Amino acid sequence: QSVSRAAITAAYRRPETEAVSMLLEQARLPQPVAEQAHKLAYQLADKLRNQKNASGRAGMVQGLLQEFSLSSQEGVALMCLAEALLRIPDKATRDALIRDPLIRKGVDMAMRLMGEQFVTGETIAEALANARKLEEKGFRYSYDMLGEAALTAADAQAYMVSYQQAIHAIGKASNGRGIYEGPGISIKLSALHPRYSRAQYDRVMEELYPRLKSLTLLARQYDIGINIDAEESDRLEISLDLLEKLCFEPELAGWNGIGFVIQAYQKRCPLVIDYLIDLATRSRRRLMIRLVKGAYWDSEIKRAQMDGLEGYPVYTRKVYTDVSYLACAKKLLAVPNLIYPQFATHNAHTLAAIYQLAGQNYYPGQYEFQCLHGMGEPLYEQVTGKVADGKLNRPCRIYAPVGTHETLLAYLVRRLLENGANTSFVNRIADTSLPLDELVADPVTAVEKLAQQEGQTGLPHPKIPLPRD
Ligand SMILES: Cc1cc2nc3c(=O)[nH]c(=O)nc-3n(C[C@H](O)[C@H](O)[C@H](O)COP(=O)(O)OP(=O)(O)OC[C@H]3O[C@@H](n4cnc5c(N)ncnc54)[C@H](O)[C@@H]3O)c2cc1C
């Protein structure tokens, strides 16, 4: 193929100067909206960073090391002494005194230790029971049965039963609350078909498609959201063929519970949106669309460098992804009859920009925010909840991984890459030396700043040359 599908294909790996140049005026926040977004972003990031006075406290340690001149060892040493001096019960005494196999096991252990913060429960019953606390406060949940990249027919069968079981449990706990207020499920197509990574069209339709359909019908019986997670870029096209067919199932007609992730770090993203708008129209439904930046960036970069093709399917500078996300968000927000946008982010500027771009006169079913468990709750503690409690009163859906240690590894590595990259907002917020204004800097303005320095808009990362170079 159709007009929208061909345009996707044609954008696959378009040059970055071109793709970024095209997004810029779509992502640019108008004057007033920009400043209200900056203000809100600053306030969110401030409260977040300085929750327990981290910056105030940083500036005490700095101003003591500065107006007396100690190292970060001599200053620590003095606090140890000041600490003991403040265990001396009587002030008179205090003042009088002063005046006068191994590698495999470490890897597995460090994974469990680091990973636990990202997991909501070992089983679906446990995760569901831990969900009332935040659900009272106005949070929603999407449960992710951890496990992906099924290597055998047995692996895939096991994931399929774990997903079926999960939908029963989630659905019974939902109890008719529906697709917006009630819990949903997230699935990975890679879990449902053996060797998904290289699967051919015909086998996927014959074997994957009947399983996707069956889980979706079950979700529909319970009236819960069922979201298709986005994985590696070379699976985008087959995921769209599966979505298309699923949208025209007679048993799914009139039901708006189908969810689908799109990744803004891909060049194709805006063209996928045009395709999705057309699919909701032809299939007579409102699609739930999670807009994310994307989780596989390091691997996509390595992959394209080994394939030696014309270019990258993703952007090479983080700021360009940020720009693509805002442009895609505007596109999504303009067609509320056709799409329920779910704006997944832990970035305070990102959140503030969406809040402002969504316009005045919010209504619950306009959009929601989303966040990953163990990453977003502090930001969204300021967002979800009553206005009289100082909150924005916008709903947030927490993506809740559910599993034991044996399903955790791939998810955890993605989290470590996310948390540990110097470009990540969650990494920069915890840096008290980075000024709030740079942390929440507008991406479009960031890109024009580069383009004036560098001589052109949207040049690739200087350390990430084309695969052929
Ligand atoms: C609820 C939820 C569901 C999600 N589901 C999926 C999913 O199904 N599939 C998926 O792929 N991702 C998914 N993600 C997104 C991903 O897991 C990260 O959480 C997200 O990309 C971080 O974006 P941010 O706005 O929070 O952070 P920011 O720090 O503002 O942006 C972070 C990122 O920018 C991108 N990036 C990093 N470096 C570069 C670079 N040099 N050039 C271009 N881009 C760069 C990467 O996408 C990285 O995640 C999901 C996220 C959430 C919150």
DSSP string, 261-297: EEETTBTTHHHHHHHHHHHHHHHTS-EEEEEE--S-H
Q: Enter the resolution in angstroms.
A: 2.1
How is domain 1-59+101-469 classified at the CATH fold level?
TIM Barrel (3.20.20)
DSSP 387: G
Categorise residue 465: left if φ over 0, alpha if ψ from -120 to 50, beta otherwise: beta
User: Which atom belonging to ligand 1 lies closest to the Cα atom of 314?
Assistant: 43
Structure tokens at 61: 């340690």
- Ligand 1: which atom is nearest the Cα of residue 188? 8
Contact 325, 30 (CB under 8 A): no
**Could you give the angle at the alpha carbon of 212 between the alpha carbons of 295 and 210, nearest 5°?**
145
Mutation test residue for ligand 1: of 292, 373, 419, the one with most atoms within 8 Å of CB:
292
Distance CA 276, CA 338 (A): 9
Instruction: Report which protein residue has its CA nearest ligand 1's atom 8.
Output: 229
For atom 47 of ligand 1, the residue with the nearest CA is 294
Q: Work out which ligand 1 atom sits closest to the CA atom of 399.
A: 1
Ligand 1 atom 38, closest CA: 318
C-alpha to C-alpha distances, 253 to 229, 245, 285, 301, 366, nearest whole angstrom: 22, 12, 8, 39, 21
C-alpha 421 – ligand 1 centre gap (Å): 11
Q: How far is the CA of 11 from the centre of ligand 1 (A)?
A: 20
Q: CA of 442: how far to CAs of 24, 339, 454, in Å?
A: 12, 26, 18
Encoded amino acid at 302, one letter: K
- The answer for 178, left when phi > 0, alpha when psi is -120 to 50, beta otherwise, is left
Spatial contact of 459 and 16, defined as CB atoms under 8 Å apart? yes
- Delimit the CATH 3.20.20.220 region(s) of the chain: 1-59+101-469
Q: Report in angstroms the alpha-carbon separations of 255 from 213, 251, 252, 286, 341.
A: 13, 9, 6, 8, 16
Residues having CB within 6 Å of any atom of ligand 1? 229-230, 261, 263, 265, 290, 292-297, 315-318, 320-322, 344-347, 350, 370-372, 399, 418, 421, 423-425, 461
